Enzyme design. Structure first.
Site, PDB file in Angstrom:
ATOM      1  N   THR A  77     -22.414 -81.984 108.634  1.00  0.00           N
ATOM      2  CA  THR A  77     -22.252 -82.792 107.432  1.00  0.00           C
ATOM      3  C   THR A  77     -22.256 -84.279 107.772  1.00  0.00           C
ATOM      4  O   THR A  77     -21.420 -84.751 108.542  1.00  0.00           O
ATOM      5  CB  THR A  77     -20.945 -82.447 106.695  1.00  0.00           C
ATOM      6  OG1 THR A  77     -20.919 -81.046 106.394  1.00  0.00           O
ATOM      7  CG2 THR A  77     -20.836 -83.241 105.403  1.00  0.00           C
ATOM      8  N   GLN A  78     -23.207 -85.015 107.192  1.00  0.00           N
ATOM      9  CA  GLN A  78     -23.322 -86.448 107.422  1.00  0.00           C
ATOM     10  C   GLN A  78     -22.843 -87.299 106.255  1.00  0.00           C
ATOM     11  O   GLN A  78     -22.590 -88.492 106.449  1.00  0.00           O
ATOM     12  CB  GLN A  78     -24.777 -86.821 107.744  1.00  0.00           C
ATOM     13  CG  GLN A  78     -25.301 -86.197 109.027  1.00  0.00           C
ATOM     14  CD  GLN A  78     -24.448 -86.544 110.232  1.00  0.00           C
ATOM     15  OE1 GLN A  78     -24.054 -85.667 111.000  1.00  0.00           O
ATOM     16  NE2 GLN A  78     -24.160 -87.829 110.404  1.00  0.00           N
TER      17      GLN A  78
ATOM     18  N   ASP B 130     -17.290 -77.938 103.372  1.00  0.00           N
ATOM     19  CA  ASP B 130     -16.659 -77.734 104.670  1.00  0.00           C
ATOM     20  C   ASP B 130     -15.272 -77.121 104.519  1.00  0.00           C
ATOM     21  O   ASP B 130     -14.827 -76.377 105.398  1.00  0.00           O
ATOM     22  CB  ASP B 130     -16.588 -79.055 105.435  1.00  0.00           C
ATOM     23  CG  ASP B 130     -17.955 -79.666 105.675  1.00  0.00           C
ATOM     24  OD1 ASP B 130     -18.965 -79.039 105.293  1.00  0.00           O
ATOM     25  OD2 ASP B 130     -18.019 -80.777 106.245  1.00  0.00           O
TER      26      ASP B 130
ATOM     27  N   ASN C 228     -22.060 -83.838 114.224  1.00  0.00           N
ATOM     28  CA  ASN C 228     -22.171 -83.127 112.950  1.00  0.00           C
ATOM     29  C   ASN C 228     -20.790 -82.617 112.575  1.00  0.00           C
ATOM     30  O   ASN C 228     -20.483 -81.427 112.714  1.00  0.00           O
ATOM     31  CB  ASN C 228     -23.179 -81.981 113.036  1.00  0.00           C
ATOM     32  CG  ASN C 228     -23.358 -81.264 111.716  1.00  0.00           C
ATOM     33  OD1 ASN C 228     -24.008 -81.773 110.803  1.00  0.00           O
ATOM     34  ND2 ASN C 228     -22.783 -80.071 111.609  1.00  0.00           N
TER      35      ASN C 228
ATOM     36  N   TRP D  42     -16.452 -83.018 107.438  1.00  0.00           N
ATOM     37  CA  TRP D  42     -15.919 -84.192 106.744  1.00  0.00           C
ATOM     38  C   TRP D  42     -14.624 -83.809 106.033  1.00  0.00           C
ATOM     39  O   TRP D  42     -14.570 -83.631 104.815  1.00  0.00           O
ATOM     40  CB  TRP D  42     -16.949 -84.747 105.768  1.00  0.00           C
ATOM     41  CG  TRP D  42     -17.045 -86.237 105.802  1.00  0.00           C
ATOM     42  CD1 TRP D  42     -16.219 -87.129 105.184  1.00  0.00           C
ATOM     43  CD2 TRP D  42     -18.019 -87.012 106.508  1.00  0.00           C
ATOM     44  NE1 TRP D  42     -16.623 -88.414 105.456  1.00  0.00           N
ATOM     45  CE2 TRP D  42     -17.726 -88.369 106.268  1.00  0.00           C
ATOM     46  CE3 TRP D  42     -19.112 -86.691 107.318  1.00  0.00           C
ATOM     47  CZ2 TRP D  42     -18.488 -89.403 106.808  1.00  0.00           C
ATOM     48  CZ3 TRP D  42     -19.866 -87.718 107.854  1.00  0.00           C
ATOM     49  CH2 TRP D  42     -19.551 -89.058 107.596  1.00  0.00           C
TER      50      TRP D  42
END
Lengths: 233, 244
Positions: free
Chosen positions: A1-2, A59, A108, A111
């Site tokens: 997740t970016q 997430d 990666n 978050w």
């Protein structure tokens, strides 16, 4: 997740004489849009651990599945999964923290900011924190996001040091948590009036209260506010 | 010619794989394990030979849990059974991850069967040395399966494998005849204890320990749980009365 999409706001938690209390709002924000309500961000694991996750909700669901799989794997070939060989809060934390630091190191991350709160087998109160960077710290009061800014002073006024933990009752801690939730609803644009609250007491056990609401709000003084300076009507 | 029994996956002039049959013999050399399907679940039972009093009783568990609802007990080479149970746990985890819903009992049975059949397909791998009786409760109710080293698996009303498999099968046939309506969970537990105690007489040279598990929609809310404590002792006493 970016880049987080659906995000969860603050989480708050503190210690008291017989255990820990954690709480979090039930809001899934799609940026500035209050898109989803009734989104439980407190995940109970067994009868001695609650995980409060703040951040990317995808997430968060991944971590939910991971915790369920960890419970299932600890049940395997373990006749003592009900007693001595059950998942301790420290085990769940250390696992989540290893996962978070690994995800950071692979560029990666998850978050999220996670607060693990529970009571160990020997009755000791466990309260610790991890984030997308893998940073771990433990304090009598722990909060994420706006929580860390606003709820932490109020909660620390109750327990500034470890020596204040034995003196703090469950009622005092729960009242402080509710006041912090109300303050966040006052001054957090991504907060929700509906929240959930877990109490892990080494004697009473796990008490999980859903669908709670912020009550006793002061808004009357808003009637007297007129203009922005010189206006009177 | 000769030599058809020296390499796995080699078809004899009859059409047989002799290594598979030798593995079946290895299973027949193992202890006795049984499974009984009741009206709302399944009950698994196994005999553990107490080779010496140095063995810690109630420990050295023989029934393995898969996911949270599947029970498996294998007769034969216990290590091979552990390998198969680990593979089945991986399959169940994969299934739950991909489709969210817990793996159905027939799906799990077919996974184990395809794994064993693959193990009967190459001369570089030895056939499995365990017959596994497994099952549990899914959205379609109770299921009891038995899988042989040949990769052949079937759904059973009651299954039994090991040295005392024949007496257990006869007693299970009696139970099926005398109970067309179906057994209850606790009645199935008592009957499994009885059948295990009856099949121990074939090798009465050494004392044995009974191990029972069950997965019932009403008695365990659909979760695989080991029968212990008061219920286990009650089943043991029921069996002791049934023998005499």
């Amino acid at each position: 997740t970016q880049q987080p999409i659906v995000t969860g706001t603050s989480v708050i938690s503190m210690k008291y004489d017989n255990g820990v209390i954690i709480a979090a709002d039930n809001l899934g924000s799609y940026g500035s849009l209050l898109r989803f309500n009734g989104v439980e961000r407190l995940i109970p694991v067994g009868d001695n651990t609650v995980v409060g996750i703040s951040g990317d909700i995808s997430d968060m669901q991944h971590i939910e599945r991971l915790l369920k799989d960890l419970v299932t794997e600890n049940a395997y070939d373990n006749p003592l999964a009900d007693a001595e060989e059950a998942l301790e809060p420290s085990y769940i934390f250390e696992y989540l923290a290893t996962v978070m630091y690994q995800r950071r190191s692979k560029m990666n991350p998850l978050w999220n900011a996670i607060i693990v709160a529970g009571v160990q087998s020997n009755g000791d109160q466990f309260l610790r924190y991890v984030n997308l960077l893998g940073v771990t710290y433990s304090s009598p009061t722990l909060a994420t996001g706006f929580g860390a800014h606003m709820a932490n002073p109020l909660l620390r006024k109750v327990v500034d040091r470890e020596s204040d933990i034995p003196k703090t009752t469950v009622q005092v801690a729960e009242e402080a948590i509710v006041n912090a939730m109300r303050v966040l609803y006052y001054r957090d644009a991504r907060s929700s009036r509906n929240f959930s609250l877990a109490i892990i007491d080494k004697n009473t056990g796990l008490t999980f209260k859903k669908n709670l609401q912020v009550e006793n709000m002061k808004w009357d003084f808003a009637k007297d506010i007129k203009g922005y300076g010189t206006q009177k009507i | 010619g000769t030599g058809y029994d020296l390499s796995n996956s080699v078809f004899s002039p009859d059409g047989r794989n002799f290594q598979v049959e030798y593995a079946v013999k290895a299973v027949e050399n193992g202890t006795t394990s049984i499974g009984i399907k009741c009206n709302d679940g399944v009950v698994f039972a196994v005999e553990k030979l107490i080779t010496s009093k140095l063995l810690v009783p109630q420990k050295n568990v023989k029934i393995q849990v898969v996911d949270r609802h599947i029970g498996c007990v294998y007769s034969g080479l216990i290590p091979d059974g552990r390998h198969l149970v680990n593979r089945g746990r991986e399959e169940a985890a994969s299934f739950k991850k991909l489709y969210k819903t817990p793996i159905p009992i027939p799906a799990f049975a077919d996974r184990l069967g395809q794994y064993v059949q693959a193990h009967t397909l190459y001369n570089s791998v030895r056939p499995f040395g365990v017959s596994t009786i497994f099952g549990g409760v899914d959205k379609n109710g109770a299921h009891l399966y038995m899988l042989e080293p040949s990769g052949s698996y079937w759904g059973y009303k009651g299954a039994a494998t090991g040295k005392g498999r024949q007496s257990a099968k006869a007693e299970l046939e009696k139970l099926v005849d005398h109970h067309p309506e179906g057994l209850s969970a606790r009645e199935a537990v008592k009957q499994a204890a009885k059948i295990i105690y009856l099949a121990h007489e074939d090798n009465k040279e050494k004392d044995f320990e009974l191990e029972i598990s069950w997965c019932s929609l009403s008695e365990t809310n659909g979760l695989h749980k080991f029968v212990k404590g008061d219920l286990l002792q009650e089943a043991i006493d029921f069996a002791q009365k049934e023998i005499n």
